[PDB]
Every structure is written in C-alpha cells, then in structure tokens.
Structure 1
Amino acid sequence: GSFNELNAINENIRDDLSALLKSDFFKYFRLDLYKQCSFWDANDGLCLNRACSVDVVEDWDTLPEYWQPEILGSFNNDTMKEADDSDDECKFLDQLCQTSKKPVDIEDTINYCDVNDFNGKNAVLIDLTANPERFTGYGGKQAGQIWSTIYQDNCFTIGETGESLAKDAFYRLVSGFHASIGTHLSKEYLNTKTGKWEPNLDLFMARIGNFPDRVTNMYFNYAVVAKALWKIQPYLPEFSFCDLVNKEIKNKMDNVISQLDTKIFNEDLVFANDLSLTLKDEFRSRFKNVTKIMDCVQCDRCRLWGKIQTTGYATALKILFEINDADEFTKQHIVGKLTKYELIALLQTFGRLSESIESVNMFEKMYGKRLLER
C-alpha cells in the first residue's frame, strides 16, 4: 500500500528530477582515479581469469571484441576534465555564493578541497550524463566477494539500545542499493544481436522480479533519501543564484522536493529516535567503509556509481540522524555544511532510485504483455 503512495510521488517528479540531474550544477561528480583497495591491486594488475566477469551471455568468446566487460564498463574520454583544488564540489553549500566572497580571500589562497579532506591523489570531474549506470558485464568472484564483505560487516556493538534495529536498517539500505543496480543493468542491457541497449525482462525477473523483497528495499531506500531531501529543504541556502548558468537550480530543486511530502515521513525510517549515539556513529562509520571498498571494484562505471550511491546513503543518514534532535540554528548549520559533493551524491542517488521504481513499473508491463501474448 505504501508502494502506491511512493510511486505516485515518483510519477509526478520523475521528469522534473531528470532535468535537474542533467543541469550543469548536478551533472558532474568528483572521482579519484587512484584506487586504494585494501585487498588486491585495484589500479593496475587488471582482473585476470574473468574473476570480475559474468557468465550471463552464454559466452563472450563468441561475441565481438568491443563488447567485453572491460569495455562496457569503461569511461568515455571526451567527457571528463581535470579537477582543480578550487573544485566547487569541495565547498560547503554556504561557501558557494557567500555574498561576493564574504569570506575575504582577495589574496593568499584557499584550498577548500584539501581542507574538507578531499585528498584525492588524482581527481577528475566526470560527466554523469555521458557515463550512465548500465549493464557492464562485471560480476564473478570479485563482485560476489565485494557484496558479501559488505553484507557480512553488518555487526554493531552488542548491549546497545537498537543493535538489532541498526542491523536491519543497514541490511535494507545495502539490499535496496544492490537491487537498484540489478534493476539498472536489466533495464540498460546490451542485445549482442543488434548492438542496441534495451530492456531485458528475463534478466530483471532473475535479479528482481522473482524476489519481491528486493523491490521493497528499493522503496525503503527511496523513502529514506526522499525524507532526507525533505528534511533539508527549509534550510537550503541560496547556493546557485550568483551563478548565471545555475541561477535557478536552487529553486528548481525546491520544485521537486516540495512534491515529496508524504505521511510516510512521520515514520522513523532509520530509527533515529531509537539508536544510541554509539550506534549512530557506528552505522555512519560502516557506510564510509562501504564507500571505501568501492575502490576494489575493477569496473570503472560501476565504481563511479557505487561511490555516488554509497556517498548518497551516507549523506542521507547524516541528515536524518543529526537533524533529528536539533534546534533550528543547528538545522541551518547542518544543511549549510553539506558539501556540493554530498548534495550531488544525495540527489543523483535519489535519481537512481527514481529510475529504478520507474523501471519496475515498466518491467511489470512487459511481463504482463508477454503473458497476454501466450
């Protein structure tokens, strides 16, 4: 029954959210090309023995050279650009249009990236519109080990208030995230017979359709992210007005968020009121580690989007935990302190979840039509 309300909300914002995500302000994301995987060599030592590929398509050996996993998951050249230490993504929403640099800086220098701890040994700005999440063929042992490690590190301090609650929330968030990716690779699948990317109903049923709970987890994630966006809206500063190109972005983000109001928000989705300060920080800490293990993903596009969504979820949790027991002054502070980096992650993550719900609707129709066919 809650699918009805959430999906209704999503039908109305779907197109407005899409256009926003395509704007100059939100279309790029800062990514460090240098991987720090605490296990195997992520950078060089490319994945051998297909320990990073999926059997799926009968056999890749019978498919053309340019349709292998390493290519389907690679970045587009003519899109990304070098990221400087002045990258707006490192700045706080408060520093974006601070009344003609109210914070002086008419001399010396100010490295916001280095300050806010963006120690990327080699960061670049990727065009998310030209590098969409899609089926890349990535999978196998590495993919499975990464997912397992993530799910297996669901261990909070015993003796705490809601240790069971935190454990359930963490699992659902990861599951919705995992499912979200499964829905996208099913929606954006490469038909090795026409070279066209098209919906693959059979894959979807296998990764999602026949496991209703994965669908439920995506709606849960959608509500969590939507609630975090709803919670910050009243404290968003005028972060875009001073920029000619993105002048209306702040207002256009308001158009979307305002259409999200639902009674579902009255619910304590991540148990903010039931988790001790110790679990809240442990919970947050687990997600940063998820964001870290993303460096072990060999597939580049998968890593980019993984970094985006995990960061998106970490931001949502930060918002919902902190804004919970906070006065108005603290709320403006909390929202004003989010980085552009974090806001892009949060909104882009909401975009992935919005498209996933839409894709489920779409696949359910394909399913219904194929059955009416036979």
Structure 2
Amino acid sequence: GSFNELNAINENIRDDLSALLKSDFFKYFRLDLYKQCSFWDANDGLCLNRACSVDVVEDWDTLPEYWQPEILGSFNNDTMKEADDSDDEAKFLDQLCQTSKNAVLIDLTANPERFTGYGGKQAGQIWSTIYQDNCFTIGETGESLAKDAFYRLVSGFHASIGTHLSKEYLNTKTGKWEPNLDLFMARIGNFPDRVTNMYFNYAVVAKALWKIQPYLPEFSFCDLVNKEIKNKMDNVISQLDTKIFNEDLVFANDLSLTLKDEFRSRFKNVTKIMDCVQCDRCRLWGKIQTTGYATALKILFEINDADEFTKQHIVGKLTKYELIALLQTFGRLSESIESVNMFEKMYGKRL
C-alpha cells in the first residue's frame, strides 16, 4: 500500500540522486585489497571449487572465455586509482571544511552492480550464513522484533541484488546488456514479500538520510570540485519527506539498549563475511550495501533518544566513508524500487 508514495518520491528524486552519486565526492569507494575469509578454516562446507560458485543460469561452457563469471564480475583496471589521504574517506564530515579559524579506490560509476554469473552453492551458503546469524540474546526486551527487523533488512538487501542482476542481465545470444523479465519474476516477482522488503529498506535508508539532514555540516563548499555537492544532497534528502517516517521501521523506541549494539554487531559481522565472496564485483557492492545498512542503523538507533548537542556529535563526527556507503546504498535501493515498476510494465505488455 504505502508503496505508491515511495514510488512517487523515488520518481521525483531519481534523476537528481543519480547525478549526485556520479559526483566526484560519491563516485569512489575505498576497498580492501586482501580479503580474509574467516570461515574456510575449521571447514563447515564453504565450496571454493569453481563448479559450485557459478549460477547455473546460462550454460557457461557454451560461451566464450571473456563471458565467463570470472570476467563478468571483475573490475576494469583503468578506473581504480590509488588510495591515500587524498580521498578524505576516513575524515569526519565535521572536519572536511574549516568551520572556524592496504587498500584502493574503486571507481563506482564504472563498476556498476550487475549480473556477473556468480551464484551456485558458494553464494547460497554465504546468504544462508547471514540469515542464520540472526540470533540475539533472548529474554531481552525486543528479542523477537530485532530479528524481524534484521531478517527483513537482509531479505531486502538480497532482493535489491536480485533485481539489479535482472535489470542488467546479459543476452548470452546478442551480447547486449538488457532486462530479463522472466528471471526477475523467478527471483523477486512471484514473492510479494521480497518486493515488499526492498521497499522496507528504502524507507529505512531514506528515513536515516532524512533524520541527519538537519545536522549535515558544510562539508563540501571548500572543495573546489564538489562545491554544490553538499547543498545538492540537501535538495534530495528534502523531497524524501513522508508520513511513513512516523513509523519506527527499525524498532528504535522498542529495542533494548544492549540489544541495539548487538543488532549493529550482526552487521559489521556481515559486512565482514563479505570477504568470502570470490566474485570481485559482488564483493564490492556487498561491502558497500552492507556498510550502508549498518550506517543507516547507527543513525536511527542514536538520533532516537538524543538531544540537540548529541545529534551534533553523531552526524558531524560520521566518516565520509559511511556517507558514501549510505547514499550509495540508497542509490541501489532507488533503482531496485524503480526496476520493479519497469518490470510490472514489461510483464504487463506480456499479452
């Protein structure tokens, strides 16, 4: 139901958000070179044999080398620049401009989240782990809800990826990246709740962005390149305003104090397992999108029972790294929400 509203919000906002997410400020993300998957130790089953790491959609053998998952889900060298202190990604928003007197940068706009062929049992297990580490301390005041929230979140993040991989599928025949209505239906379409969870997430990440807007410092005016950027982001955050934001989508007002952090743990601990993803491009976004939600949560759980002086520390002293993650995640969510509609039509003009 409440859908429709987000669909309008998403429409009057898509053009500007994209142009924003392409800006120099938001077009690069810092990614750790070496990946340490702590899970392939005292073995549980994590399949690394290429046979079980590929979605059995296309018949890969019957395809060229340069079309194998190994290539579809790999960055494009030429783009990724060196990561030092120049990418203030580590700084806090409150310290980007003067108020008074082991990794690299991946060009995001160049490595869009799409169908890479990655899947199979390896991918199945990953997802499976995340859904399973949904177990907070019982007895706590909010036990249940925390998981219905957590689960819901992941589930959307899951659909978010699925949608993207269907809107940007590869025509194994013509060799043109195009939408795949059938696949969209098999993964998302025929499962009402999955489409609903993406909307859920959109409302969370949007409400998170909204909540902090009033506190975003003047972080970009001083950078000769991205001047407008801060203001151009306010502009967006504003058109977002909704009645939905009155719901406590993430049970902030009902969750335990200790319990909350626990909820945050599962996430930095998901964003971690993201190193067990052998596909390079899937890992990238799984690490952005996950840090995204993790940040959305930090924002919501704290702005909650906080005064003005506090809402200051919080937002201002939040890393550029996190703001890219957040907005970038809202970017995926924005397009997933839209590809849904763009598919209901495609499905409509079926007969």
In the superposition, the TM-score normalised over structure 2's length comes to 0.96
Map 1:94-243; keep pairs closer than 5 Å.
94-99=94-99, 122-243=102-223
Aligned-pair CA distance for 1:165? 0.3
Aligned-pair CA distance for 1:43? 17
For the aligned residue pairs, the C-alpha RMSD in angstroms reads 2.9
Structure 1 residues 211, 42: CA separation in 2 closer, same or farther (over 3 Å shift)?
A: farther
Aligned-pair CA distance for 1:195? 1.0
Asked if the contact 1:51/1:139 (under 8 Å) is kept, the reply is no
Unpaired runs of 5+ residues, structure 2, are none
Note the alpha carbon deviations across 1:128-159, whole angstroms, 9 max, x for none: 01000000000111101100000001001010
Structure 1 residues 46, 281: CA separation in 2 closer, same or farther (over 3 Å shift)?
A: closer
Q: In 1, distance between residues paired with 2:309 and 2:159?
A: 37
Secondary structure class of the residue paired with 1:51: helix
Q: In 2, distance between residues paired with 1:367 and 1:43?
A: 43
Aligned-pair CA distance for 1:354? 0.2
Asked if the contact 1:93/1:337 (under 8 Å) is kept, the reply is yes
Structure 1 residues 282, 79: CA separation in 2 closer, same or farther (over 3 Å shift)?
A: same
Note the alpha carbon deviations across 1:232-270, whole angstroms, 9 max, x for none: 000000000001110010000011000010010011010
Secondary structure class of the residue paired with 1:321: helix
Note the alpha carbon deviations across 1:163-212, whole angstroms, 9 max, x for none: 00001000000000000000000110010111111000011000000001
Note the alpha carbon deviations across 1:10-57, whole angstroms, 9 max, x for none: 000001000000000000000001101102389999975334533433
Note the alpha carbon deviations across 1:78-119, whole angstroms, 9 max, x for none: 00011114530000001111248xxxxxxxxxxxxxxxxxxx
Asked if the contact 2:47/2:121 (under 8 Å) is kept, the reply is no
* Corresponding residue pairs, total: 350
Structure 1 residues 71, 44: CA separation in 2 closer, same or farther (over 3 Å shift)?
A: farther
Q: In 1, distance between residues paired with 2:182 and 2:38?
A: 36
Note the alpha carbon deviations across 1:284-340, whole angstroms, 9 max, x for none: 011010000000000010000000000000000000000000001100110001100
Asked if the contact 2:146/2:251 (under 8 Å) is kept, the reply is yes
Name 1:85's counterpart in structure 2.
85
Map 1:276-295; keep pairs closer than 5 Å.
276-295=256-275
Secondary structure class of the residue paired with 1:129: helix
Structure 1 residues 251, 292: CA separation in 2 closer, same or farther (over 3 Å shift)?
A: same
Structure 1 residues 43, 99: CA separation in 2 closer, same or farther (over 3 Å shift)?
A: farther
Secondary structure class of the residue paired with 2:39: coil
Q: In 2, distance between residues paired with 1:99 and 1:272?
A: 32
Q: In 1, distance between residues paired with 2:48 and 2:210?
A: 45
In the superposition, the TM-score normalised over structure 1's length comes to 0.90
Structure 1 residues 330, 294: CA separation in 2 closer, same or farther (over 3 Å shift)?
A: same
Unpaired runs of 5+ residues, structure 1, are 101-120
Q: In 2, distance between residues paired with 1:181 and 1:209?
A: 13
Structure 1 residues 43, 350: CA separation in 2 closer, same or farther (over 3 Å shift)?
A: farther
Structure 1 residues 145, 44: CA separation in 2 closer, same or farther (over 3 Å shift)?
A: closer
Secondary structure class of the residue paired with 1:16: helix
Aligned-pair CA distance for 1:281? 0.6
Structure 1 residues 19, 86: CA separation in 2 closer, same or farther (over 3 Å shift)?
A: closer
Runs of 4+ displaced beyond 4 Å:
41-48
Moved more, 262-271 or 42-51: 42-51
Name 1:116's counterpart in structure 2.
none
Asked if the contact 1:240/1:249 (under 8 Å) is kept, the reply is yes
Moved more, 277-286 or 39-48: 39-48
Q: In 2, distance between residues paired with 1:42 and 1:17?
A: 44
Structure 1 residues 350, 269: CA separation in 2 closer, same or farther (over 3 Å shift)?
A: same
Asked if the contact 2:30/2:321 (under 8 Å) is kept, the reply is yes
Name 1:62's counterpart in structure 2.
62
Aligned-residue identity in percent: 100
Q: In 2, distance between residues paired with 1:78 and 1:58?
A: 28
